[PDB]
From Swiss-Prot:
The enzyme consists of two functional domains, a catalytic core joined to a carbohydrate-binding domain (CBM) by a serine-, threonine-, and proline-rich, highly glycosylated linker sequence. N-glycosylated. The catalytic core domain comprises three N-linked glycans which each consist of a single N-acetylglucosamine residue. Belongs to the glycosyl hydrolase 7 (cellulase C) family. Disulfide bonds join 8-25, 19-35. The chain holds residues 478 to 513 of 513 of the full protein. It comes from the Eukaryota. Glycans are attached at residues 1, 3, 14. The gene is cbh1. This is Exoglucanase 1.
Amino acid sequence: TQSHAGQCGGIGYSGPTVCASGTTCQVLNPYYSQCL
């Protein structure tokens, strides 16, 4: 559980994909996933 301020991922992510809480690591476009 880690506090990624917005960008949890984005497919091709230069770092660890795992946020803290909310509900999900949610898709906007396939290449942009956000901490929602």
